[PDB]
Amino acid sequence: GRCLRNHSITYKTPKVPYERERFDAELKNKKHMRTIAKVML
Amino acid sequence: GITRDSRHKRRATGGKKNSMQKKKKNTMGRQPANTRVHDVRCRYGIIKRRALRLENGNFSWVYNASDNDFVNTLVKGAIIACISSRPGQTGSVEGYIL
Amino acid sequence: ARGLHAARKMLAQRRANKWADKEWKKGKLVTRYKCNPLGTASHAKGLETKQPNSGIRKCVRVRLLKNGKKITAFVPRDGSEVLISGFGRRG
Amino acid sequence: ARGPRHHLKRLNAPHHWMLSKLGGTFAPKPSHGPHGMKECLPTKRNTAMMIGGNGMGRVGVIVKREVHPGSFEIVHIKTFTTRLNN
RNA sequence: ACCUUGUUCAGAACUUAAAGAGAAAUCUUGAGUUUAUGGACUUCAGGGGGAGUAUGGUCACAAGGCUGAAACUUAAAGGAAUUGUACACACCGCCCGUCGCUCCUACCGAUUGAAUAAAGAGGUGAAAUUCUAGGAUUAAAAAUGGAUUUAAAUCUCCUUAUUUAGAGGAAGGAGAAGUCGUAACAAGGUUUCCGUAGGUGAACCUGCGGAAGGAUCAU
RNA sequence: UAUCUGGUUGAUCCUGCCAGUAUUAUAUGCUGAUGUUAAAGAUUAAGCCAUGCAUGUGUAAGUAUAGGAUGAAACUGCGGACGGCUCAUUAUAACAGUAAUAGUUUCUUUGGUUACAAGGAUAGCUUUGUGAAUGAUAAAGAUAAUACUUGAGACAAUUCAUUCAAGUGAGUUAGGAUGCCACGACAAUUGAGUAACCAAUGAGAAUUUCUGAUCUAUCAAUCAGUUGGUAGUAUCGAGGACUACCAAGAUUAUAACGGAUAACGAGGAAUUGGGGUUCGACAUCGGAGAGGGAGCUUUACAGAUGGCUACCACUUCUAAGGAAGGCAGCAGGCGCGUAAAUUACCCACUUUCGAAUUGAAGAGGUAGUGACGACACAUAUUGGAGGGCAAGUCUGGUGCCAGCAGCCGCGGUAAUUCCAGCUCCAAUAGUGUAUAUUAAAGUUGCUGUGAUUAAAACGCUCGUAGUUGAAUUAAUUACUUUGAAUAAAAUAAGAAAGCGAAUAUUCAAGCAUGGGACAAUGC
RNA sequence: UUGAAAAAAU
RNA sequence: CGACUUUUAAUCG
Numbered sequence A: 001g002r003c004l005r006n007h008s009i010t011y012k013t014p015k016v017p018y019e020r021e022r023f024d025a026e027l028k029n030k031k032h033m034r035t036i037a038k039v040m041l
Numbered sequence B: 001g002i003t004r005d006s007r008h009k010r011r012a013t014g015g016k017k018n019s020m021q022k023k024k025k026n027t028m029g030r031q032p033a034n035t036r037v038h039d040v041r042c043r044y045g046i047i048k049r050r051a052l053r054l055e056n057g058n059f060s061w062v063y064n065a066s067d068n069d070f071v072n073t074l075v076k077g078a079i080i081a082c083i084s085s086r087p088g089q090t091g092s093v094e095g096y097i098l
Numbered sequence C: 001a002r003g004l005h006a007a008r009k010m011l012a013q014r015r016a017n018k019w020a021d022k023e024w025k026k027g028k029l030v031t032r033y034k035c036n037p038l039g040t041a042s043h044a045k046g047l048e049t050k051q052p053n054s055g056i057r058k059c060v061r062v063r064l065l066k067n068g069k070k071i072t073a074f075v076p077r078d079g080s081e082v083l084i085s086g087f088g089r090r091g
Numbered sequence D: 001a002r003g004p005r006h007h008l009k010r011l012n013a014p015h016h017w018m019l020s021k022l023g024g025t026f027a028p029k030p031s032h033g034p035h036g037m038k039e040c041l042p043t044k045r046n047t048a049m050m051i052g053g054n055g056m057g058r059v060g061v062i063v064k065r066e067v068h069p070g071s072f073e074i075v076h077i078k079t080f081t082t083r084l085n086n
Numbered sequence E: 001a002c003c004u005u006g007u008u009c010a011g012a013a014c015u016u017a018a019a020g021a022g023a024a025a026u027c028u029u030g031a032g033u034u035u036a037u038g039g040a041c042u043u044c045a046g047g048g049g050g051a052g053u054a055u056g057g058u059c060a061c062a063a064g065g066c067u068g069a070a071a072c073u074u075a076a077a078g079g080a081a082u083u084g085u086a087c088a089c090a091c092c093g094c095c096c097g098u099c100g101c102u103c104c105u106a107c108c109g110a111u112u113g114a115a116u117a118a119a120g121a122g123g124u125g126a127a128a129u130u131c132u133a134g135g136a137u138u139a140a141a142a143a144u145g146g147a148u149u150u151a152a153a154u155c156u157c158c159u160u161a162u163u164u165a166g167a168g169g170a171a172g173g174a175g176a177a178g179u180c181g182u183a184a185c186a187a188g189g190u191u192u193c194c195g196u197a198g199g200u201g202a203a204c205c206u207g208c209g210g211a212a213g214g215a216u217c218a219u
Numbered sequence F: 001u002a003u004c005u006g007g008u009u010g011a012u013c014c015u016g017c018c019a020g021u022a023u024u025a026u027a028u029g030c031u032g033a034u035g036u037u038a039a040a041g042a043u044u045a046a047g048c049c050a051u052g053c054a055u056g057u058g059u060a061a062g063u064a065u066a067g068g069a070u071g072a073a074a075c076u077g078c079g080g081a082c083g084g085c086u087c088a089u090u091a092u093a094a095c096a097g098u099a100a101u102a103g104u105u106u107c108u109u110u111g112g113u114u115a116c117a118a119g120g121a122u123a124g125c126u127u128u129g130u131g132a133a134u135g136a137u138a139a140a141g142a143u144a145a146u147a148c149u150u151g152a153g154a155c156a157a158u159u160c161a162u163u164c165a166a167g168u169g170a171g172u173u174a175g176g177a178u179g180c181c182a183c184g185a186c187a188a189u190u191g192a193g194u195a196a197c198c199a200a201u202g203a204g205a206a207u208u209u210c211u212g213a214u215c216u217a218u219c220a221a222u223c224a225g226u227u228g229g230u231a232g233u234a235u236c237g238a239g240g241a242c243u244a245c246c247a248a249g250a251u252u253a254u255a256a257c258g259g260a261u262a263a264c265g266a267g268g269a270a271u272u273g274g275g276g277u278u279c280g281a282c283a284u285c286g287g288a289g290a291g292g293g294a295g296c297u298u299u300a301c302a303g304a305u306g307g308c309u310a311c312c313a314c315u316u317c318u319a320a321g322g323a324a325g326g327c328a329g330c331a332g333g334c335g336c337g338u339a340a341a342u343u344a345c346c347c348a349c350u351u352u353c354g355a356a357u358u359g360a361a362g363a364g365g366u367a368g369u370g371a372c373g374a375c376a377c378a379u380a381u382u383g384g385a386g387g388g389c390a391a392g393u394c395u396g397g398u399g400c401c402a403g404c405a406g407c408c409g410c411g412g413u414a415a416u417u418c419c420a421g422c423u424c425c426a427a428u429a430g431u432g433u434a435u436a437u438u439a440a441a442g443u444u445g446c447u448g449u450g451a452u453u454a455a456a457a458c459g460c461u462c463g464u465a466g467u468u469g470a471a472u473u474a475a476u477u478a479c480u481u482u483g484a485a486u487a488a489a490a491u492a493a494g495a496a497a498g499c500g501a502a503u504a505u506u507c508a509a510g511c512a513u514g515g516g517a518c519a520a521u522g523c
Numbered sequence G: 001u002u003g004a005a006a007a008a009a010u
Numbered sequence H: 001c002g003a004c005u006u007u008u009a010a011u012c013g
Ligand SMILES: NC[C@@H]1O[C@H](O[C@H]2[C@@H](O)[C@H](O[C@@H]3[C@@H](O)[C@H](N)C[C@H](N)[C@H]3O[C@H]3O[C@H](CO)[C@@H](O)[C@H](O)[C@H]3N)O[C@@H]2CO)[C@H](N)[C@@H](O)[C@@H]1O
Pocket: E175
């Protein structure tokens, strides 16, 4: 390890870079519990 | 000098061990001062009475089982009576009449 | 083998068959330290086309500081110690 | 180590001392005495008291005491189980 | 007994399939019961070349067999189908091998080819210690001598990795239009291919024996 | 998000790979308004080091004419064996978990027990000096001790031989008794200090039990102190650890012995539908090292190297006779390389050491550089416009040339791909490029692949090891269920952050337990 | 009975 | 040098 202080990522870029059905829907900039529900169901 | 660790011996299969460190003081060995009385500062500060040579001896009521060559070194179990103390460690010869 | 106690063969079988892998083997045997001009490094400081395409590719020959081997290097753009870093395809 | 250790690290300190992980690089080393390093402090962890394992902080009365000559012996308390030393 | 019928096994096959499987050709006594994925076990394969080549090991009298890489090179190579077809610019097609010309890569290497860095046995051996002798000095105790122990450092043969090497070389690979032939794809004009042996500028040719992936499922 | 798309053909369906994609961490190209957090000479050279600091310490209670408390120096005491750095070693070695020490054990701390004072010398003090000088040393004259001794107020534990003998699963065991040896006190101390022993601290240190590691047969046989036995030695202590005698034994296809690593191991990290693959020098635990070996000193602990000694290899001062040193501590210089910051301040946090509440600490904190990264957040760049893949069938030149293109390919004078100009496309203070890890990859297959023709069933049979082995019955092991026990950090969990979660892990082993259907071992 | 060949890319 | 061809490659003077 390198540091005692924790850190996290607050987003994840999509797998497919260019898809029209996503460019329109998403359009300042373009910058969990479902599975938690899943595991108990 | 003399070490007593098993880092230089082989394995039960005959393998040669490979060095990963150097000699450490906790494996100290010492030159056997044959009792044909000094003191040695052992670990933890205790003292060992190293009897270099000695002739008198307490006993209670010609042959060495280990090495015939020793026949006049004084060691435990030697016949002279049979010595029962460790003269090289305790610093005196204590034996019993056969 | 499929039985419950035959974990020795399938472990052994897989180890043998991995060596057939061109990509996997290249990363384990000793050529990335003696045959790769770049070694394992990214960049390296140093000092006519195929049939259906005609023209001339301007290129350069470079002797590496560390290894000393001579390699052919392209020039990036139109009309274009040197740092060389591979191409699109790896190796 | 050439000799007995003197310093103590914050992380290596016992859990129940409740020391934070960012307060300071070191933690106070308990001196030798009547209580051990991990059994002292320089249910959140006859009728008896649990000082050891998972039952630490629990009070109650013993029902029976299985004994195994091999390794240890077990105490059952009104019910939870734990070794004698706890 | 031999022939004609039934019944139940073992064996070599064959016919049909609207079914099952497959990329299809086809398979059906499996190539079925496989994404609805697991009956038991052994062996082999991982794009095409370089290559069954180099090195090393081993077997044979030898030819050779068995085990067997890497460097480097390249976007395809290949399968089954839309009388045979490797053709689709469609035979005025495609394609093979030697040679000629540049460049690159590994291999060998008369030049006792070396050279360097790391591992065991034998010889020399510092120093410090254990013991011993000595006791200048003021029982203690320093120089010093001697014998053990532990042994650095060095020399001699031998065991792993990294490097320099020219006659002497010998292979492979890449680059539109360079030579000689017609080897292969149609019966490719001598059907083709495999093993082996011999000959030959080159594809290759011929002998012995197989195979159809044959141009014959057939008298 | 359990996901694919371009490319072999005139066209089709495959095998199969290349390419495309996302991500993690390294470098790097262009560009940059803030606030918070934060990596940072490891890879290449455990290569070489200029310079400065990193370990010293004083209370009423040791010694002080340098007697009021105070009081520098010096003697004496304690520590520098912790801390900090690095990962060169190392392949059952170290390490992790578990078990033992009825086979050892101090230091500190804590609890308990057991002669109205004697004797001398020594530094600082003063004096003489010496050589260039080291943390340089020589002479002489004094003076103290909680320095060094003797000495008494009166035992404690070691060795030996014999004997009586109660905890523990288990002891001729703790312990008592007999005779002997050894050692021998509770400072002849100071305004608190001390010796011997017992216990704890101690689950600790150290040895040791069981299980567990990457690739390799172009490593198949290996070992002679080797394997065991006796007796001694040596050790803090078990033991071939060693010596003498005796024996022929130990390991191996369930991979021994040997070889490679760009190998310190673990807690962990990256990525994952499940399963897995790769990394872990680097916060914390353990190990090892201080240029290379080796030999030692002091102590309670060192085979110490900011201690010594010798050799090898270097570095430095020199008045030329001599002299010291070990940055893989903090800064910093070179060399190396693609690849890594200040020759800053202070003990104020945390903690440690000290004769101690004060002193010291390049541990530690603060400040500096710092698009490594992460979180929030102004208003401008990066690449691209044929397809994959979102975006122009706009205008000028170039003419298979220059060039672009990760792949398909575009360019041979009318280019949707070149060089320009305009416009819009994705993201945005970020975005290109190269390399490598993972997913894609059901292209490594336990879940899960294929083997007629695409790569791939040994020419065939026998056969050892291995694996797999029909039905049937009213001691272990495997299996299975529960517990015990189980460092933190981290993971998940009760703006990134931070701080009491039952917080659950965390497997491989090991312990206890209910069960005996499917199994293996002999009876 | 003989019967060889067709420069590179669109 | 030109001629040739969609370009080239050669060829022909
Ligand atoms: N690939 C290695 C071997 O090459 C052999 O032969 C090689 C050459 O001898 C052969 O040469 C051909 C020639 O056949 C044909 N008749 C003429 C053609 N110009 C040559 O071509 C070759 O050489 C020229 C030289 O300028 C290069 O520019 C060209 O790129 C290259 N292919 O082309 C091959 C590639 O260099 C066998 N043809 C081949 O089967 C084998 O694989």
